Amino acid sequence: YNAISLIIILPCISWLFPLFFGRQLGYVFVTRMTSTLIIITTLITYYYFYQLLGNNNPINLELFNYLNIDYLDINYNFEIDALTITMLLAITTISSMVHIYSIGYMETDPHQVRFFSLLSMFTFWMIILVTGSNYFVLFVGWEFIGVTSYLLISFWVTRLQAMKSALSAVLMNRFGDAFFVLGLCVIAYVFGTLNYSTIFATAYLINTDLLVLIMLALFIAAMAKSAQFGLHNWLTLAMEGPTPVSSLLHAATLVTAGIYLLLRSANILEYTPTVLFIILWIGALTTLSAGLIAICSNDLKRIIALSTMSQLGMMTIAIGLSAYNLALFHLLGHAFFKALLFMSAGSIIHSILNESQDIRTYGGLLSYLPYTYICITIASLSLMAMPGLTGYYTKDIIIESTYGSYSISNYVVYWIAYLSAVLTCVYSMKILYLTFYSNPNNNTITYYNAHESNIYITLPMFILAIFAMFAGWILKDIYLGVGTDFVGTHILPNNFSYFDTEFSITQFYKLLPLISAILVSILIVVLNEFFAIVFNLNNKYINTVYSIFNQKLVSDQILNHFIIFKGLVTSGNIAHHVDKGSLYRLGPVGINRLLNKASYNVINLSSNTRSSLSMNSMLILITIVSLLLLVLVMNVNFIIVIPVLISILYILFS
Amino acid sequence: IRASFDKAEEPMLGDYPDIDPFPAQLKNPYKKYDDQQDRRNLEEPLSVNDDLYDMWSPDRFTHFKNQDALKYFIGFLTIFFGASYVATYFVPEKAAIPREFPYEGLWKESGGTEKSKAFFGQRS
Amino acid sequence: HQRPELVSFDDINYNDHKKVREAQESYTREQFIRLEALKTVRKALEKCYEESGPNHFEDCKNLAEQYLDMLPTHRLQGYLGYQRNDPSK
Amino acid sequence: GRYPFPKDVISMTGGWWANPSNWKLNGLFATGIAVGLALWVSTATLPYTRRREGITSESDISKWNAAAGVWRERHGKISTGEA
Amino acid sequence: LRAYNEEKELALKQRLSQLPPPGKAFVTAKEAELAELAEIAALYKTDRVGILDILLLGNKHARLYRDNTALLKDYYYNGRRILDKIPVKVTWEIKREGAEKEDWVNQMYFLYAPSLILLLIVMVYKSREDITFWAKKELDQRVLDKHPEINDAPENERDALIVERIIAGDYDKLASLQKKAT
Amino acid sequence: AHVLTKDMIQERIVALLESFDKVNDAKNITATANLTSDLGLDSLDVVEVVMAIEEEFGLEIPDHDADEIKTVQQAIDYVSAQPAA
Amino acid sequence: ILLSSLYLFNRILAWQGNVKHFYLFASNLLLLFIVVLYINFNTFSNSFQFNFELFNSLNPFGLSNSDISNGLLFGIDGLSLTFILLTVLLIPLTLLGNWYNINFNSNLYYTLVLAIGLVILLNFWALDYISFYILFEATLPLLFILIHIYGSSDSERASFYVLMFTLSGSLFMLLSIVVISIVLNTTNFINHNLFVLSLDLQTIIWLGLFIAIMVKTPLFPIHVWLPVVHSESPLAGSMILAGLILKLALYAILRLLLPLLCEAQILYTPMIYIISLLTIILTSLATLRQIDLKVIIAYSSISHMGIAILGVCSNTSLGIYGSIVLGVAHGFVSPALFLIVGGILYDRYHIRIVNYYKGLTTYMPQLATYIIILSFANIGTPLTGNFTGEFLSLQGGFIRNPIIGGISCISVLLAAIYQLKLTNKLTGGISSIYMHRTNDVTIREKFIMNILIISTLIIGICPQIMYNLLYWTVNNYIYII
Numbered sequence A: 001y002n003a004i005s006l007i008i009i010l011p012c013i014s015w016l017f018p019l020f021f022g023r024q025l026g027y028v029f030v031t032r033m034t035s036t037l038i039i040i041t042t043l044i045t046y047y048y049f050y051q052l053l054g055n056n057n058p059i060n061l062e063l064f065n066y067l068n069i070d071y072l073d074i075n076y077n078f079e080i081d082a083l084t085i086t087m088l089l090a091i092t093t094i095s096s097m098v099h100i101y102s103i104g105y106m107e108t109d110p111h112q113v114r115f116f117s118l119l120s121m122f123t124f125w126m127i128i129l130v131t132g133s134n135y136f137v138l139f140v141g142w143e144f145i146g147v148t149s150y151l152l153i154s155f156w157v158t159r160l161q162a163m164k165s166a167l168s169a170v171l172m173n174r175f176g177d178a179f180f181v182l183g184l185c186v187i188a189y190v191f192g193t194l195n196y197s198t199i200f201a202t203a204y205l206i207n208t209d210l211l212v213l214i215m216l217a218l219f220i221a222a223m224a225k226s227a228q229f230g231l232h233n234w235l236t237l238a239m240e241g242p243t244p245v246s247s248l249l250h251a252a253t254l255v256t257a258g259i260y261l262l263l264r265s266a267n268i269l270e271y272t273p274t275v276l277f278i279i280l281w282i283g284a285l286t287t288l289s290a291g292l293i294a295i296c297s298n299d300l301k302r303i304i305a306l307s308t309m310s311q312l313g314m315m316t317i318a319i320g321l322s323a324y325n326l327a328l329f330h331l332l333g334h335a336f337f338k339a340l341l342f343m344s345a346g347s348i349i350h351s352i353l354n355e356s357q358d359i360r361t362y363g364g365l366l367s368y369l370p371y372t373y374i375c376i377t378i379a380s381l382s383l384m385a386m387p388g389l390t391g392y393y394t395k396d397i398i399i400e401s402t403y404g405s406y407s408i409s410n411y412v413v414y415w416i417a418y419l420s421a422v423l424t425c426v427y428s429m430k431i432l433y434l435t436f437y438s439n440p441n442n443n444t445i446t447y448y449n450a451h452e453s454n455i456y457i458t459l460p461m462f463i464l465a466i467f468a469m470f471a472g473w474i475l476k477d478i479y480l481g482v483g484t485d486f487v488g489t490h491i492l493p494n495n496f497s498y499f500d501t502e503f504s505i506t507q508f509y510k511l512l513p514l515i516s517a518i519l520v521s522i523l524i525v526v527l528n529e530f531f532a533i534v535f536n537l538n539n540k541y542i543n544t545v546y547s548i549f550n551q552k553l554v555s556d557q558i559l560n561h562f563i564i565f566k567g568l569v570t571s572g573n574i575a576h577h578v579d580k581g582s583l584y585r586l587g588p589v590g591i592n593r594l595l596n597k598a599s600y601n602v603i604n605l606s607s608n609t610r611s612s613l614s615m616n617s618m619l620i621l622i623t624i625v626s627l628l629l630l631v632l633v634m635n636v637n638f639i640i641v642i643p644v645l646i647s648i649l650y651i652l653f654s
Numbered sequence B: 001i002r003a004s005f006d007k008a009e010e011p012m013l014g015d016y017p018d019i020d021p022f023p024a025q026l027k028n029p030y031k032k033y034d035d036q037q038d039r040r041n042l043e044e045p046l047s048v049n050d051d052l053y054d055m056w057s058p059d060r061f062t063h064f065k066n067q068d069a070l071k072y073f074i075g076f077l078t079i080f081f082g083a084s085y086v087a088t089y090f091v092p093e094k095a096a097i098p099r100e101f102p103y104e105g106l107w108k109e110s111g112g113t114e115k116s117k118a119f120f121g122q123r124s
Numbered sequence C: 001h002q003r004p005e006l007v008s009f010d011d012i013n014y015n016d017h018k019k020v021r022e023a024q025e026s027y028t029r030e031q032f033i034r035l036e037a038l039k040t041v042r043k044a045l046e047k048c049y050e051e052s053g054p055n056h057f058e059d060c061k062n063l064a065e066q067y068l069d070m071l072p073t074h075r076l077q078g079y080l081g082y083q084r085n086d087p088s089k
Numbered sequence D: 001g002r003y004p005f006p007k008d009v010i011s012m013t014g015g016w017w018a019n020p021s022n023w024k025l026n027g028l029f030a031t032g033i034a035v036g037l038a039l040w041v042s043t044a045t046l047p048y049t050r051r052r053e054g055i056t057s058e059s060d061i062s063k064w065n066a067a068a069g070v071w072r073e074r075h076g077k078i079s080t081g082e083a
Numbered sequence E: 001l002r003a004y005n006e007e008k009e010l011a012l013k014q015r016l017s018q019l020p021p022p023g024k025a026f027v028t029a030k031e032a033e034l035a036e037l038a039e040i041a042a043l044y045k046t047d048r049v050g051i052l053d054i055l056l057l058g059n060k061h062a063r064l065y066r067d068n069t070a071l072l073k074d075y076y077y078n079g080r081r082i083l084d085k086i087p088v089k090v091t092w093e094i095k096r097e098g099a100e101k102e103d104w105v106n107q108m109y110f111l112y113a114p115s116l117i118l119l120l121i122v123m124v125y126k127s128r129e130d131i132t133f134w135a136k137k138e139l140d141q142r143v144l145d146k147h148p149e150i151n152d153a154p155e156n157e158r159d160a161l162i163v164e165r166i167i168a169g170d171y172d173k174l175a176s177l178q179k180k181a182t
Numbered sequence F: 001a002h003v004l005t006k007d008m009i010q011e012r013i014v015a016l017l018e019s020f021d022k023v024n025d026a027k028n029i030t031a032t033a034n035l036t037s038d039l040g041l042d043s044l045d046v047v048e049v050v051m052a053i054e055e056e057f058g059l060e061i062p063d064h065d066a067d068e069i070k071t072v073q074q075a076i077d078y079v080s081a082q083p084a085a
Numbered sequence G: 001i002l003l004s005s006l007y008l009f010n011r012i013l014a015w016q017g018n019v020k021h022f023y024l025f026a027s028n029l030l031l032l033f034i035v036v037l038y039i040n041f042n043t044f045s046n047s048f049q050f051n052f053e054l055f056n057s058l059n060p061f062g063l064s065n066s067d068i069s070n071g072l073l074f075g076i077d078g079l080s081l082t083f084i085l086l087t088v089l090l091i092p093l094t095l096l097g098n099w100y101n102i103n104f105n106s107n108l109y110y111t112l113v114l115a116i117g118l119v120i121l122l123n124f125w126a127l128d129y130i131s132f133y134i135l136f137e138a139t140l141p142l143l144f145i146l147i148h149i150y151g152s153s154d155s156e157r158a159s160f161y162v163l164m165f166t167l168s169g170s171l172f173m174l175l176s177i178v179v180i181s182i183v184l185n186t187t188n189f190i191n192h193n194l195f196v197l198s199l200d201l202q203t204i205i206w207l208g209l210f211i212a213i214m215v216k217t218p219l220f221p222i223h224v225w226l227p228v229v230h231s232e233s234p235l236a237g238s239m240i241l242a243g244l245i246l247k248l249a250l251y252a253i254l255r256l257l258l259p260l261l262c263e264a265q266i267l268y269t270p271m272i273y274i275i276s277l278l279t280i281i282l283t284s285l286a287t288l289r290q291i292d293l294k295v296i297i298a299y300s301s302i303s304h305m306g307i308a309i310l311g312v313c314s315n316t317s318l319g320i321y322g323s324i325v326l327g328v329a330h331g332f333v334s335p336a337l338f339l340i341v342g343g344i345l346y347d348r349y350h351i352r353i354v355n356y357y358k359g360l361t362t363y364m365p366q367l368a369t370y371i372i373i374l375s376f377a378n379i380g381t382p383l384t385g386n387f388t389g390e391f392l393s394l395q396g397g398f399i400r401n402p403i404i405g406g407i408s409c410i411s412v413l414l415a416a417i418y419q420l421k422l423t424n425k426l427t428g429g430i431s432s433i434y435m436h437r438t439n440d441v442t443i444r445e446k447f448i449m450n451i452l453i454i455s456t457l458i459i460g461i462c463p464q465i466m467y468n469l470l471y472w473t474v475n476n477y478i479y480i481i
């Protein structure tokens, strides 16, 4: 019994055994088998976490050599430490729940063996991603979760839009991976190694320009992974895949890898205060844009995905404050209630005969689906950081850190973050009302047939509801404790400010996000139930700004017309005008034309003549005389004869 | 015919049909086609740049013109960043001093050396 | 375990190919020994860091500095530079 | 619900609603192989497992740092920022 | 192995002669003619000669057997391709499950594939004599030859002491070889 | 799951038309009744009715096929022709 | 033996009438023989080992035991053994990939294919400039005949391209080799790093060698022959041309150029980096607008060759190791992709236009899985040898010039784009209306694809397994004072 070996090897079996034996086993056995393996992995992980809190002495597993070329020695090394165990808690819990949920949610689907193998594949490669002890193992996991995301978003292969969504995701994350490879090259050159131990051993002595180069490349990679406002577009397109896929990808593992890559690099990031600044302001932009788009969206999964985008921006702000523990705790807490939101949305969608995702097409369902209502309600109130709930202990303290941060200018971030927070309430209430309170908007047969889902759906929602009520309170001391030493990241003492953000905070700032949340939630509900005109006006200008927000701050158009379409036009220019234009001209086509004219001219040098004797005799006379005169010229000056020879060649061949 | 890059190819055809191109995505999807997914009928002529107008080409957005969308996107970024920068000026001052540390800022604990205490060393 | 005799480019006549081959192999093998020394220093540094934690900055300063010093000079460099150039002139 | 599908199309994943009639026996084989593989892996990788801290003694760490200082004094090596 | 028979062959030719060309020999899709097609095509997989006769005999017999085998192969494969039935069992049975070996399998599975496995094994064990291991051992031996007293130390102390000596001192010989650089 | 039958479609359409206030009479609504003629529905009113039908059976009628349905039987056969409704 | 084996060949031909079983057997024996040679190859020595001389004046038809060397020299070191192993792994697969689709005049076809393989294998044994050049050119007429007689509709233009472009570059290489011959009166590779020509003459000789390299690799801007030749070639031609023949140029850089013209190479490296960056970027972008499957696959090879060039000219051990590993991995994966597009799809449908193909996953799930695997291998997914080669090549390139290698890191994205754009359309969507359902991949096609995938996976998981043949090589050619 070795916990680390089992934690790695069991999801590998749950991945590969369906691909080897699916035709022989069938989806009944495959679903039950993969779910059981993931459950056992999750249990082993929880036990390891318990012991580690007992005794923070991480296990390492050191295996065969990958490369041992000149000074670069890379090994398949894995370790489970505090950071990794927090990641693994999220990954394994959400993965086991999603596996159980999919038995019910996908019961009708013909292709369940492939689907469950792919969910297990994603779990295995994400575990590899977080457990590796050097940047190479991290990159192996990084690229394989991208491959798995491509296979999942395009799971419904016959659907054109799904294939294009998958292509979007895989290509934007390959852009990130290009900058990742750049960073790895810089790291290997500067440090002679990719191991965490050596890089964190010597990073404080390193030249700062080099550290900025490395961290900038790594941050562009994480930006694409965690859908910051540069490279977000694929995140909402990923809602083409089945809902359990969205639950796994947007809560626990995929979009968190970027955050992890910044958390694992915090020791380097302490010495790069410029990129921390860029990280901070990128996150503020991301959270604002996500909230604004969410307020004007009508697709349930799209609103939940944009909420994920806002939360990732919030974690990125935390990173930029060097409150890495804060970002880590918010990652772990956000995973649970985000997974619950997505699973509850899946229930709502399956409760409609049409299976519509338009929030404008539901409207009275509180009476019909009380349990899905209560689950989605708990998740929303966790997101809104309502008192005594898991989201409170993460979101609120991250918001307050910005005010408590030593950097003066960071005060602006406070207000940005606060606006995002209230903006969050606005969309949560909007989906809460429009789904459960409003007045029925679907036709009468849907309400007759509207029922709750099976146990396979319901039980995971119950488990994650308990998590989203209790985990934050039971874990607040591990991650946000006055001197907790569990996550051992070396924060520069000048930077550390978690005490200042608690003692220096006033009542106005410590209380204003909470009161604003409560008041805005009530406000939104009452204005919807009593003054629908204020929301449903018809102003031309307001409809315009709403249209801006509804089409993702036209970003997706901007990308598709000015980069991608322009790039395809430029590729056409290169392929037709250069490759099949100029390059064939200085090639087969031009040479063929040239030789045709030249050969024609030389053979027709004596074309129209009738008497071969007379013409050939004239040629010998002309040759003799011309050679004499040419040589006379050469005796004079050889340079003067070069143009004459050029002209003679021109006469003969052209 | 319509776009600059389709026009630029006009000298490059001799005896190929000069087709006016239309993005397949914008063809109405309730008509019937031999290939419903691609919205194409058999023997239908292709534009020379057909690969940029078929269903697998990048999606086209109709609600705004591309130029106006560029205006809105730049404007959103401009107003957000300018507002944040300006707000940086009208900022309150903090009330507590940044904290300090024994041993001249623990310059020894963060590596550091007698001869090099400015590089490594806290606020003391 | 083999220990071939070391041969220098500066002593030999470039027309005995056996001596030239031995000099090339000697140069390459010495570079690989240097790489081994660098790897030893780096492994000691990793051990020191993992057992020191927050006070690695103090307890591993010598190892960190020495690893960073030997990194540029203890890599493979080939023999062609030295065989085709005579440093004296 | 369901629909017809071509029966000749053989996929390693089983194709459409693959639910073989003898699936319980095949599942017993598959679980046996899974248990064997997991236990072999867990046992074989045991010698390559170790804890992170308290594996080298303070004697080794201190003397290695001392030797590196010796090396840096033989060469002329000032410290970072030491100028 | 010797298996030829000229007596059989010169009659097999005429038994072929009655049949239509293998291109048109099944384009009806009576069953008696199809049954003879089944038998005569089944002759293709009944191997008719071994090595002792290809090596020893002459080219007239060879040319005739070659021709016969050409038409047999045409009949067998055309019946198999149109009817979907194997020409064994002897009237055109459907039993396609198994008993179908292609003419490349033996070579690729018993010569090529074992050769590739042997190459992988050889590479694995050749990688043990890699320069990195030699130079590890050589550094250790140089240290042990310069400071033999760490031999007297017990086993578990020994490796730490070699590491200490390596760290402190520059045991390479690169600069020694660079004589003319003073 | 849920499956509709020709008579269920007919009963839903008949109740739908019975609910409409612009109609001449409720008792006169037949399966082969003409909305334009028998029920005396205006040009725009039959449009409102087609829109009601699509809002009821959850489908999307194109312009060309909407204007083609003139009788109730035509509506029923159209709604039974569509798999997802 | 030779007399007896010729009798064996003659009798087999008399009785069977098809030579292909004998050729498959001979090539499998050749692979086994090379493995036996590897068993007896000493790795703790940077000297050529299995040496022999042909056409010496004392023994024109035998092996030379003379004190004067005036014949053609042959022998191997670790570098050449690597490529020889790749060659003998590939040859039987190129025979087996055309087992059923060649029907008229098949004996000549298989003879041409096997001859081309044997010529390349001998080319890797050559130990002097003239023997190398002879085996370098001898493939051109065989390829001309093979493409002209057994190629697709446009195969006449293709045969003429494959002859004329390669002759064009080779003649400038011939100028360089003649200059070396008359200036040094020696031509062999054993001691040619002992001759130091004046920097000016070095600079001149380099140009001829590099023009030949530019056409054979190929590099921008003289690459445009390769898509045509690959597209119109029969399958064995494409497999040999992409898996083996292009690797001869990388081998030529290591064997013919770097040891002799070291200083000139230092001087010329920035120009090489310009050319390679142009190759990578421009050919990757030009691939996006191609409509022929085989053309797209062919264009992919050029960009990967650019990355390999950047590695091999980086003056670092990591870069040279990455270039060699990339060459080997490309030799595994590119023939597999050519097998898919010009062997499996083309033999079922006899067409290569991308518009006709869509949604193959429905009737051919196995082929779709192969396509997905080979695509992600081709764009350098880790645990594949392609990733190791590209990553090490980019490391070396970045060290050699940080700006140029840093920009070169965009190839990850660009390759992902063109490849995944093709595979997305090939596998997804509804089955195409233009084609009828055919058989899924056969046992023979799966066997070939499985061999290639296992090879690339084995060197992707543990690239170190090549080091025992190459650790001298990664130091033999760098020029550092």
Ligand SMILES: CCCCCCCCCCCCCCCCCC(=O)OC[C@H](COP(=O)(O)OCCN)OC(=O)CCCCCCCCCCCCCCCCC
Pocket (backbone or CB within 6 Å): G049, G050, G051, G052, G054, G063, G115, G118, G119, G121, G122, G125, G134, G135, G138
């Ligand atoms: C038309 C194109 C231009 C043609 C110009 C070149 C024509 C060459 C004709 C091919 C003949 C070369 C291959 C046979 C020569 C090798 C014979 C031999 O015995 O090698 C000698 C070498 C050392 O042997 P030895 O010193 O006697 O000691 C033995 C101790 N037991 O023993 C060894 O170390 C073994 C060496 C193995 C070499 C591998 C050769 C692989 C290819 C063999 C056949 C290639 C046929 C190519 C046909 C197309 C034409 C190129």
Ligand SMILES: CCCCCCCCCCCC(=O)OC[C@H](COP(=O)(O)OCC[N+](C)(C)C)OC(=O)CCCCCCCCCCC
Pocket (backbone or CB within 6 Å): A012, A062, A063, A064, A065, D041, D044, D045, D048, E124, G457, G458, G461, G462, G465
């Ligand atoms: C499949 C999911 C993972 C399963 C892992 C289970 C491990 C159980 C035993 C591990 C022992 C071990 O790996 O040892 C590796 C041994 C010797 O290595 P070492 O130096 O003595 O010790 C290693 C640990 N160190 C260094 C920290 C002390 O060399 C090898 O064998 C490598 C042979 C390569 C064969 C070619 C690759 C074939 C790839 C096939 C892809 C299908």
